[PDB]
Design a protein around this ligand. Structure first.
Ligand SMILES: *[C@@H]1O[C@H](CO)[C@@H](O)[C@H](O)[C@H]1NC(C)=O
Ligand SMILES: [Cl-]
Lengths: 385, 259
């Protein structure tokens, strides 16, 4: 790249992160209309995957995607600088051996359509989306083959992504992402015990509860009445845990979740020696994203009126049929061998501060340099997926 | 230490578990008693009190004098209605007949607060709060209906107790209603029921009521708002009613109505 172009790229990193987290919070509010329970997806993975579809789209088909992802304010000198933004960021996530992240995407395209190699190579090289021709007319075979590809790339952790295939299918976009991190200060499994968890004010369940002692950053929003706790990972990533005060509605906060709100929390953080009680959990969630994306203004591409003619010249009638994301997140005690910090003594009038996550909570996993929101989630019951 | 939904010997209104005990709390304008369980009316605007039309029911009236929607009082100086209703006319006047015939109380609406996540297309979050120029004189001029906390509504009121759908004739009329789960209701109404709406079975078509009508439920001598009636599917002729799930808007109520 040129001098001014390299300038544009790094300058646009913050802006891309901010917009993608607002895209994320908007998509969260859509998902919440259909689901009350456990919830996790990846704003980054979705934006990466959908931005890949712009390579083939022209006109409103393309423009709506760009607006829907909150990316319209980015004006690059060359169109290809936006994909290079995504290429740089995902490669840095990859290079982090310390970060236990697995991510990828597929574009399963009906065999009628002659996929141009420009799209084919650029989608792989920039977004690592693999275009794979498929015969959907033989639906049961397409199901087995597609599931094979995802099986391979996830090393068996997602063995059968697909349950059903419409033989009328034109294009299916799949984004998968799996993560289990290592904490910067680990929990001691000797102190992990079965504690009560309030599914709600009238319903309790027993769950494994991890115990952590040392220096942690946190803050308390006096307006919304919620605690925000930073749990840093190895590999330059952090989980923010958002815990509403006891008589409050965790679901209610989602309407106010903005990039700006999170930033206000982050700069009001104070670090102190304290105790953290936090449940072990695993989430595995898949969503049909295309209808949710429609409600965020990404419409033409999921219609017969889509223009992906650049993606392939062959006709009748190239649109996207489905867009899937499946997200797997696991949390346990494991971390790097940090030395344990000293808590303050227990006196007659006080003991160390404590945040006890024994009721439903939200979490956000951020990459630290960029601020990119890799995971946005909600745990209402840690004993199920 | 746990809040027992199966029993009647615990809190009267709301409950909160933890420790090895449970802290009871009350609805709007009620004092927590000496026994830490009962809720006694304290303020003049003690919510949800009936006697022997309805203290909380109001009509929305336009500049020409035409009534177009219904609404329910939820605070001394605030009425809740649908967003569609609040956006139909620029100058809206709330009116009530409670404790008045040819002389209803008129009150001008100084501000309109459409929900921040209202979307006309999808029909999500179709509510608005209307601030009154002058507060209602409780209890003689009127009374607000209680707004329940989330879990209380969704585990104690709606699934267990029979409800009352009350409002103004579309062209006060009250009928009992009961809960129908989303899977069934979606197929009857040919829609997808969201987490912020739910369905009531009705012995009469939905078009019987005006937009802005409400479902209420009694509990230990107090009436709680659980639903608001807005845009009905399939013409509003079906014997099920799709209402907005009020229990999910408690934070919005506070954020707006506390200024
Ligand atoms: C009606 O309002 C009058 C005047 O404020 C009040 O004195 C009276 O108690 C009310 N009557 C009833 C039956 O609500
Ligand atoms: Cl889904």
């Amino acid at each position: 790249a040129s001098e001014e172009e390299k300038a544009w790229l790094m300058a646009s990193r913050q802006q891309l992160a901010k917009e993608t987290s607002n895209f994320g919070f908007s998509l969260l509010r859509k998902i919440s209309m259909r689901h009350d329970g456990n919830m996790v997806f990846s704003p980054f993975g979705m934006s990466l995957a959908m931005t890949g579809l712009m390579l083939g789209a022209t006109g409103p088909t393309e423009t709506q995607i760009k607006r829907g992802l909150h990316l319209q304010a980015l004006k690059p000198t060359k169109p290809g600088l936006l994909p290079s933004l995504f290429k740089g960021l995902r490669e840095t996530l990859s290079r982090n051996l310390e970060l236990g992240l697995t991510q990828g995407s597929f574009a399963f395209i009906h065999k009628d359509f002659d996929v141009k190699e420009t799209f084919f190579n650029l989608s792989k090289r920039y977004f690592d989306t693999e275009c794979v021709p498929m015969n959907f007319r033989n639906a049961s075979q397409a199901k087995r083959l597609m599931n094979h590809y995802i099986n391979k790339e996830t090393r068996g952790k997602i063995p059968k992504l697909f349950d059903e295939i419409n033989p009328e299918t034109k294009l299916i976009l799949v984004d998968y992402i799996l993560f289990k991190g290592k904490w910067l200060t680990p929990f001691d499994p000797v102190f992990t015990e079965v504690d009560t968890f309030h599914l709600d004010k009238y319903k309790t369940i027993k769950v494994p509860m991890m115990y952590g002692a040392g220096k942690f950053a946190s803050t308390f929003d006096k307006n919304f009445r919620c605690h925000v706790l930073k749990l840093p990972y190895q590999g330059n990533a952090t989980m923010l845990v958002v815990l509403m005060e006891k008589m409050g509605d965790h679901l209610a906060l989602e309407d106010y979740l903005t990039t700006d709100l999170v930033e206000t929390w982050l700069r009001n953080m104070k670090t102190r020696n304290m105790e953290v009680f936090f449940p072990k959990f695993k989430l595995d969630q898949k969503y049909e994203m295309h209808e949710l994306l429609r409600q965020m203004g990404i419409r033409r591409i999921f219609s017969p009126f889509a223009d992906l003619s650049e993606l392939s010249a062959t006709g009748r009638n190239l649109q996207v049929s489905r867009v899937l994301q499946r997200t797997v997140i696991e949390v346990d005690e494991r971390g790097t061998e940090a030395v344990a910090g000293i808590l303050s003594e227990i006196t007659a009038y006080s003991m160390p501060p404590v945040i006890k996550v024994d009721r439903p909570f939200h979490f956000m996993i951020y990459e630290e340099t960029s601020g990119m929101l890799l995971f946005l989630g909600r745990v209402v019951n840690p004993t199920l997926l | 230490n746990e809040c027992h939904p199966e029993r009647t010997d615990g809190c009267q209104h709301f409950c909160l578990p933890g420790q090895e005990s449970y802290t009871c709390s009350c609805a709007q304008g009620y004092r927590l008693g000496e026994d830490h369980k009962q809720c006694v009316p304290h303020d003049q605007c003690a919510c949800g009190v009936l006697t022997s039309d309805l203290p909380w029911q109001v009509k929305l009236t336009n500049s020409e004098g035409k009534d177009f929607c219904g609404g329910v009082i939820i605070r001394e100086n605030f009425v809740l209605t649908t967003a569609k209703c609040s956006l139909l006319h620029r100058n809206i006047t709330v009116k009530t007949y409670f404790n008045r015939s040819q002389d209803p109380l008129m009150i001008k609406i100084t501000h309109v607060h459409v929900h921040m996540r209202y979307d006309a297309d999808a029909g999500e979050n179709d509510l608005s709060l209307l601030e009154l120029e002058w507060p209602i004189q409780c209890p003689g001029a009127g009374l607000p209906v209680c707004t329940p906390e989330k879990d209380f509504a969704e585990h104690l009121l709606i699934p267990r107790t029979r409800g009352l759908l009350s409002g103004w004739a579309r062209n006060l009329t009250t009928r009992p209603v009961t809960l129908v789960e989303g899977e069934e209701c979606g197929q009857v109404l040919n829609v997808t029921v969201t987490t912020r709406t739910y369905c009531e079975r009705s012995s009469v078509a939905a078009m019987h009521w005006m937009d802005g009508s409400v479902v209420t439920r009694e509990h230990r001598g107090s009436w709680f708002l659980t639903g608001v009636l807005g845009s009905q599917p399939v013409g509003g002729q079906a014997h099920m009613v799709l209402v907005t799930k009020v229990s999910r808007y408690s934070l919005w109520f506070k954020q707006i109505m506390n200024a």
